[PDB]
Ligand binder design. Structure first.
Ligand code: DGT
Length: 627
DNA sequence: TCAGTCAGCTAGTGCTGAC
DNA sequence: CGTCAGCACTAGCTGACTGA
């Protein structure tokens, strides 16, 4: 059929005869500021749409290039940018199309599969390189990952998902794809009926491109509305920080963290042997063999028939650790707890990690998200790096490149500093400008001891009590809290004494507590002005939201500043989990990387917490788990 | 030729736990 | 502390193998 090959020369199979070629005169501006009546060919669909979204476009091929096309990108303040790929596995997938949508002009499609010369790209490369150009991208992490992975460098992004989900105040956790965003904000219906059609083939149907163009173009009107809205609520600082934080996260995904196959294999063997001996020990102790050990009901029944009793002689009703913590006396319970520890460690780490190692590079790559978390903290998906255990320094398996060295850092008591800033408390500022940790003050005032006499146990108690009641935790609940992360034994009178003693001097904390509990606002706001509207009031989460949101914001700003500064020595950002950032630099640059990291994080802290200076616990380590 | 099971799949609790 | 994961496990639901 000649109909299906109407524009086969442009690598567009005419599956549906609903198209038309057309070449118009364009009054583009010359480099000498002279209007030139050039002309390029653009394709249109015979069937229009009720929407005002642009539908024309150009396809730039190896043999459809005209050098004057680059003038369309000249002297421009913003451009949309949509990227479509063959799949989802970035390390082994090729970018399919690069979309650019200039205002009052058709979308420009770079048919990458049909591009073999450099001249077409360098204009687009320069267009991406400019720092006075804003890029509108849907879920900018995706497109940025693919761009940097195929030798591109973006230097300004205004992702629509970031701004929208910041605006939504976490009212809803779903319905934020492109169609939902346009539906909500614009009065348009994109009709995303494309069910992921085939893309790997060079030849692509016409309707497929026509849909692919709309998503690129509609980001422009979306930007026009979203800037006005987001500026209206004074959310420009949070938007700017979050959006400048789209490059470093992408670099962290691309670089990954190396896994030591030799050490991992060794540890798997040793833990397997230990698990075998422990399992045999438990099975012999349980006096039975039919009982599959891992199950909870059957092992509970085994304990019950073993006549296992508590201090009050009652039979054990459950095997919860908080319950098993009460019966450490019995011999079988110790073995059971040990077995469950080893099996949890085994299944959680040593069988999970091998599934998530890119053998082509011997590395583990996360999928970080920056707005999924309630407080805006990061949240590692697929391989959850946060769920890797701290125990034993199991991080020995993770080591840097064969000629590189890690640099580890972390904020020291960021939550307390943020709380002091928000409450404007006098005593915390006094202690901090006195170069004294708040933990020492809490321990002293609890024990009424001299400052030099604060032992490590008192420091632990101070940390526990401070973190317990900084977020408004009922003093009766402290009894259970003690045997939840500190294993401490506490009495109601002692709990009350600590409770009263804290607010007896931490006046600003008490003022903050009373105001939060009294107002019962639905909408809360951070120091970065990040906002959230709860379904109702929740006192603990209410107090928790501002300080932890500010923590996420300060960490993101630090990441942005570190990324910008590290370009001098060409380093790599590898991971950020819990107020802790690790970078990786080859040798001969470590004494400079230390300065870069410390100065960057210090500047980031000085931005937000004006009253209190922050202190960084930096270090240098051959392995992530170094002491 | 179609009732009546049993052999796989699925929802859900439920406990369990460590970050 | 709430937010994930990992388990079995318990039960229920459903099409293939008898049953004549
Ligand atoms: N909910 C909760 N989060 C924890 C706990 N331990 C650590 N985290 C996570 C989330 C917290 O925001 C953050 C607190 O970090 P830490 O205070 O344990 O570390 P840091 O070295 O800053 O301790 P410091 O206060 O300086 O003694 O880490 C815990 O027991 N409970």
């Amino acid at each position: 059929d000649e109909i299906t090959k109407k524009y086969i020369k442009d690598n567009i199979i005419n599956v549906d005869d609903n198209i038309i070629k057309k070449k118009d005169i364009f009054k583009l501006k010359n480099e000498n500021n002279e209007i030139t009546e050039c002309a390029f060919e653009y394709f249109e669909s015979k069937k229009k749409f009720d929407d005002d979204i642009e539908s024309r476009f150009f396809i730039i091929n190896d043999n459809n290039y005209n050098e004057n096309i680059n003038l369309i990108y000249k002297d421009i303040k913003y451009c949309g940018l949509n990227i479509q790929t063959t799949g989802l596995e970035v390390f082994d997938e090729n970018i399919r199309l690069i979309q650019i949508a200039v205002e009052n002009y058709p979308v420009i499609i770079y048919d990458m599969f049909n591009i073999n010369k450099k001249d077409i790209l360098d204009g687009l490369r320069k267009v991406l390189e400019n720092k006075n150009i804003i890029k509108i991208i849907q879920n900018g992490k995706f497109d940025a990952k693919f761009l940097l992975h195929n030798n591109f460098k973006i230097e300004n992004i205004f992702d629509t998902y970031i701004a929208s989900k910041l605006l939504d105040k976490n009212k809803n956790m779903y319905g934020f794809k492109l169609n939902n965003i346009v539906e909500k904000y614009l009065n348009v219906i994109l009709d995303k009926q494309q069910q992921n059609s085939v893309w790997n083939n060079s030849l692509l149907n016409n309707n497929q491109l026509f849909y692919a163009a709309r998503d690129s173009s509609c980001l422009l009107k979306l930007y026009k509305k979203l800037k006005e809205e987001i500026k209206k609520e004074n959310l420009h600082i949070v938007n700017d920080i979050e959006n400048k934080c789209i490059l470093p996260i992408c670099d962290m995904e691309l670089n990954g963290i190396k896994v030591d196959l030799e050490n991992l294999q060794k540890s798997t063997n040793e833990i397997l042997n230990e698990l075998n001996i422990e399992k045999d020990n438990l099975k012999k102790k349980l006096k039975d063999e039919n009982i599959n050990v891992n199950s909870q009901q059957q092992v509970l029944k085994a304990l019950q028939k073993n006549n296992v009793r508590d201090i009050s002689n009652k039979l054990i009703e459950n095997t919860s650790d908080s319950n098993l913590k009460n019966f450490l006396n019995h011999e079988e319970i110790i073995s059971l707890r040990n077995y469950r520890r080893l099996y949890k460690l085994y299944s959680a780490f040593y069988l999970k990690l091998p599934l998530h190692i890119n053998t082509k590079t011997n590395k583990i790559h996360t999928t970080f998200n920056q707005l999924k978390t309630f407080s805006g903290r990061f949240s590692s998906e697929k391989p959850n790096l946060q769920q890797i255990p701290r125990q034993k320094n199991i991080r020995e398996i993770f080591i840097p490149n064969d000629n590189n060295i890690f640099i580890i850092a972390d904020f020291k008591q960021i939550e307390l500093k943020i709380a002091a800033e928000i409450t404007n408390d006098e005593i915390m500022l006094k202690a901090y400008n006195n170069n004294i940790d708040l933990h020492t003050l809490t321990a002293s005032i609890i024990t009424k001891k001299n400052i030099p006499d604060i032992n490590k146990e008192d420091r632990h108690i101070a940390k526990a009590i401070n973190f317990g009641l900084i977020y408004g935790m009922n003093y009766v609940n402290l009894k259970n809290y003690a045997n939840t992360y500190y294993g401490l034994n506490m009495s109601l009178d002692q709990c009350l004494y600590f409770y009263n003693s804290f607010f007896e001097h931490y006046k600003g904390i008490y003022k903050w507590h009373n105001q939060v509990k009294q107002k019962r606002a639905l909408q809360y706001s951070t120091l970065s002005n990040r906002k959230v509207i709860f379904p109702y009031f929740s006192f603990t989460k209410a107090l928790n939201y501002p300080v932890q949101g500010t923590c996420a914001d300060i960490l993101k700003l630090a990441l942005v500043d570190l990324y910008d500064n590290l370009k001098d020595i060409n380093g790599k950002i590898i991971l950020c989990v819990h107020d802790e950032i690790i970078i990786e630099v080859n040798k001969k640059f470590q004494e400079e990387a230390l300065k870069i990291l410390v100065q960057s994080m210090e500047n980031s802290a000085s931005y937000f917490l004006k009253k209190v200076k922050c202190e960084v616990s930096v270090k240098i380590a051959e392995n992530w788990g170094s002491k």
